[PDB]
Design a protein around this ligand. Structure first.
Ligand code: PG9
Lengths: 617, 617, 218
């Protein structure tokens, strides 16, 4: 039979070799780099065609290393093959390496959610540090086109690895830049925020742990996750129904609801500070980082405290989580002065990395922190930062007190008073407008800049505001919530929001008229008032004193604006509802446990609630 | 060591017992159904929980059966898990069956692009007809919740498997409803349109034939395919640069550019007619079907002519290709009266299937064709259709002649004249506004309803039009292009467009003012004027008679509108450019072969170009 | 299925809702015009209209009722069917034998927005379709009591004027009572995901308590 007409075999080639590969401006090298313990890890090496001694940019990811280096699958040009955030490193001729971490996708070995460093929690002879160390060692002895210099970077889990590496790095690692890294998953990163559980985790669990490679989400009954989680009951009730009870990590997490030894052994900010890294560091996080707000800022400062003898600069732009590796010209309705993300990547990130990765490049001298001013809409270069804080700073914080008539005042109100609001667990306050499903990345990403008018309109939320500003108020640092709240129940959650009320009217941009834009806000689980490690019941109807740090600010409350403070006791469905009744484990709360409580925020007098603002000149 | 604190194993569970399954209102059975040649086929069986005597709706697909039955992966409800077009059957409590065709994804065996039926082109003991037979046979003997009756359906390739099944169906196949089926890939379905090659095929090849399962697209150099293909030159040159030269199917196509025995042996419309089948059929295709316009209508008609002794209804809605299984309220800027797609599915599709799959159901008596009137905006039930055609119809077609002054008249222009336009291959007319890439699905889908005003403005496109209508003109049937065109070169393509010019002003919808909506248009490869099987060079400057059928219409040109006829010689980058110089195989055209030509469309007299309109009362 | 004055424009959609064609034009061409023609264009064909020509927002089609409504409180062929509120924040057609009550706190300092903030009366784009807006925001509030039936097994059909038989007490001396009859869309609507669980109000109104006995004498 004539093969050109009659086909008996298969129209699928037995072996391909498309010329598309010769039309490329790069070379992709795939190799199972073997780790000390004999476990091999999937590694992708993207080498620019005709590369003579180029620095390597290394990234270890639990998010499929192959695809990470495949923005545009098998792209003709490297620029399209590599992520948006590599633009400056592609422009610079860097080699790009994306490695599948031990246990995920292409790599071998067991996968352990944010594998704790070698210690009480990990007695094996391997960890995310050794693996990183081995990889760098292999990379400098197996990439002839490279110059033996390695730089590390990545966001979230991809940044968590940069930190794990910084614990005990390989000589080759000359410079590191963790971006929105997963440092303290309990204190205020991905899992908990001051003890308050983030229900968004359940999905991620079944997503990254159902199988070595790609998995799926948890099938939902209702399209609105507000309904899904509320109709389910307690966070544990959801996990159980989703079958998460059979997932090892969940079991561990559930077993440790408080900030006990389990979570303390993972606090990379403290652990890293103990090791005192000597490798230049560029810590990055978004001012509106909706996923890892604790990480960077705390690690940078913890190192600053240990007097590290190495570059340690903190960079914070007007971005959401992982926003630095994309376009930062806008976030929600907000608009900034140009692509702030690219801005940093080109004018700071790259030069800094060039200094230690490309012998002969110009030397930079970054200040303690480079932060975007969300008030003046300009980049701020602070030699020493912050200038104002609680203890050990040039100056102290400036308290903005709560006053009568739901107002705010810089003058300590002598008149003793209180404002009550009923917090009904049956009707929790939606962290963002309903409906919302955790799957709605579109809605999730910029949730931290959304208008707070909806919340204000509810009776279970208390709002305080200054008069319309006649002189601008400049704040630069970490504001502190000096809370003197009282609750009818034996437990409670305290959400405190620092807001910048936009001018009553903004004729240039009508939509922003009287927009309540939160510049800093967080939640605090009342049971941990005395000790994070030792949860303890609150005294009903007693005014208890809370003191916690809110996300850093570098903003200006301009004329026409107002400073606003908002307090509530729920944040559904992002955070699981506090039963308002002290229970051993909130994960296992029962229908009868959830109790309607009366909250009273004391203002003025000796127990004067306020926001300790980092006011500067 | 404490396990709930220390993990030495993998956070990834060995197995899973998701309780989500218990909540589901259906069950999924995955079976490796064995064909008569020992080869087993993947078969997803979706059974409504607690089913009894339920009809089976079967679809054989080369597009991953597992994923086909996973609209919302692992969904809690069947309605969710199954595609939009299954709605009426999910509601009916049908057993849904999706099977991977031999050689694709979960299925075993060899893959042969549109595997030719048993005959000169395929001597083996099996084919898509037998596999279907074997499948149906198994289904009715191993699905205990089924009543033994099976109905087959699917769109495109999924509709092609239905036609193959109809060549020799299993006694259990009680009804079939092919949807926009791949019937004649050369004549006017998916590959060629009257000999003109569609450059969209290349991506399809690499995507659907690179591997057994999922594949990928061809990496592009430019974001605009108009550029991509023009720069490469001839379709074959692109295929070569893309690396398609190693794929068997492409080789076979490249070796058969004309309508020879290779394509004639695949003409399912004629083959099915030779077989005189007795299974109730409900043919469907979109009036604006941009992928398989030939299929349904031709196969259905062929059967009608063959005096088929079984139900044979044709259905054509205001949909794009495969638009029948989605919402059919709109199409581009066009808006119809409600979900026309859903309407058909609920009011015709299911009832028809219910009659033969659910014994005891009322009997429906469908007419010859149920076509949606794109002028009156309502469904038309034609007892005998069409009422007008060239040979053997109640009446004939009324010609709309090209006249002087670039007009269109129903009165045969006595005056002999011609209008000429220059067709430069270095500047082909974009089939839709630049830039366009074949990957741009959003633009591809509704390309046939796009404004033709851009073309009109070109010096290489002749535009004719009636005077604003004072009386509406109703057309219902298949318009024929009676073209007397002449080209200076030895080859040429002829694009004829039948357009409905909207009123010069549409205050209720301002954007539609003067809009040039094409109700029917197509292209014809000149070299095939005399014989589709034997290409012949055209005589330079000779008025040649081209006579070919255009897409079927069921429109109405109302007062305020004008009928328009547009003629051009290119349609890039959808259709490869005709070199305008006769070459043995246009696929292998060389840079120098491409020649600028002067096309002259003659109007009036003995060679009066016209559109034989199927005008009815 | 139109908003105010919607008859003189397009009637294919209202807010996120979608209807079968231009329902507004439909009426203008099939009913309005021919009707007028009969009396205005002598010799025209006469039309025989029923009592009510109403569009069905559930069946998605026009309903021609010879005599409408068929059910009502007094003088109709049939009577209204009471959908009783019940403990467990549910609704049942079976009169709950046991007594009961559910409470909420209406704080005038934080009134319920009729539509999401911020809204200015000048925003016509928001005012026009406000009646079909999602009532999920209200439901999440502690100052809005909500009752619902179990996911329907068989459809419940309604045609006529619903009446609110409400027995409520306020700790004050005056109060407004807003009652909302809502059709909750299916938990998940895979064809149109945004509609999933959408709380669509088919009928709602407010009643000033001070006029309970006499609209004339508060
Ligand atoms: N009609 C679709 C399809 O069958 O899916 C198609 C076939 C071949 C090439 C490109 C598209």
């Amino acid at each position: 039979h004539d093969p050109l007409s009659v086909q008996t075999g298969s129209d699928i080639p037995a072996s391909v070799h498309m010329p598309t590969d010769q039309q490329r401006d790069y070379i992709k090298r795939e190799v199972m780099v073997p780790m000390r313990d004999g476990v091999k890890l999937y590694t992708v090496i993207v080498i620019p065609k005709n590369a003579r001694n180029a620095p390597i940019l290394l990234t270890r990811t639990p998010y499929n290393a192959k695809g990470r280096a495949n923005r545009v699958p098998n792209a003709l040009t490297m620029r399209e093959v590599l992520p948006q955030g590599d633009d400056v490193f592609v422009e610079g001729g860097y080699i790009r390496v994306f490695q599948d971490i031990r246990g995920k996708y292409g790599s071998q070995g067991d996968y352990v959610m944010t594998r704790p460093p070698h210690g009480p929690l990990n007695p094996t002879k391997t960890d995310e540090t050794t693996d990183a160390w081995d990889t760098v060692d292999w990379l400098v002895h197996n990439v002839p086109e490279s110059n033996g210099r390695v730089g590390m970077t990545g966001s979230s889990y991809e940044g968590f690895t940069v930190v794990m590496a910084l614990l005990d790095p390989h000589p080759a690692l000359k410079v590191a830049a963790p971006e929105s890294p997963m440092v303290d998953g309990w204190m205020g990163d991905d899992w908990f925020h001051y003890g308050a559980f983030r229900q968004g985790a359940f999905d991620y669990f079944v997503s990254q742990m159902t199988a070595r490679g790609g998995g799926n989400d948890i099938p939902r009954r209702d399209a609105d996750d507000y309904t899904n989680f509320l109709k389910a009951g307690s966070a544990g009730s959801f996990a159980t129904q989703a079958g998460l009870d059979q997932y090892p990590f969940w079991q561990r997490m559930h077993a440790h609801p408080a900030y006990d030894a389990f979570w303390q052994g993972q606090a990379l900010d403290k652990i890293l500070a103990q090791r005192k890294p000597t490798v230049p560091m560029l810590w990055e996080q978004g001012l509106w980082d909706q996923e890892d707000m604790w990480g960077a800022i705390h690690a940078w400062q913890a190192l600053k405290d240990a007097d590290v003898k190495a570059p340690n600069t903190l960079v914070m732009g007007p971005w959401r989580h992982s926003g630095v590796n994309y376009n930062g010209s806008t976030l929600g309705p907000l608009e900034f002065e140009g692509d702030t993300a690219h801005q940093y990547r080109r004018d700071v990130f790259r030069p800094f990395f060039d200094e230690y990765l490309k012998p002969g490049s110009a030397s930079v001298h970054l200040p303690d922190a480079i932060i975007y001013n969300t008030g003046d809409q300009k980049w701020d270069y602070y030699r020493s930062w912050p200038s104002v804080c609680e203890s050990n700073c040039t100056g102290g914080l400036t308290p903005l007190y709560l006053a009568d008539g739901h107002g705010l005042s810089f003058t300590h109100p002598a008149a003793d008073g209180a404002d009550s609001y009923v917090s009904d667990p049956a009707h929790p306050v939606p962290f963002i407008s309903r409906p919302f499903a955790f799957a709605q990345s579109s809605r999730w990403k910029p949730w931290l800049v959304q208008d707070q008018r909806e919340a204000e309109s509810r009776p279970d939320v208390v709002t305080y505001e200054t008069e319309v500003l006649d002189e601008p108020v400049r704040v630069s640092g970490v504001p502190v919530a000096d809370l003197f709240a009282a609750t009818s129940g034996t437990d409670s959650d305290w959400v405190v929001k620092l807001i910048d009320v936009q001018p009553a009217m903004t004729p240039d941009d009508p939509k922003m008229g009287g927009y309540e834009l939160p510049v800093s806000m967080d939640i605090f689980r009342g049971r941990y008032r005395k000790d994070f490690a030792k949860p303890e019941a609150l005294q009903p109807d007693a005014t208890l004193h809370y003191h916690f740090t809110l996300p850093a600010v570098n903003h200006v409350f301009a004329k026409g604006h107002r400073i606003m403070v908002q307090i509530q006791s729920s944040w559904f469905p992002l955070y699981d509802r506090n039963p308002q009744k002290f229970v051993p484990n909130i994960f296992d709360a029962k229908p009868a446990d959830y109790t309607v409580a009366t909250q009273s925020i004391h203002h003025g007098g000796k127990e004067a609630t306020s926001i300790l603002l980092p006011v500067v000149k």
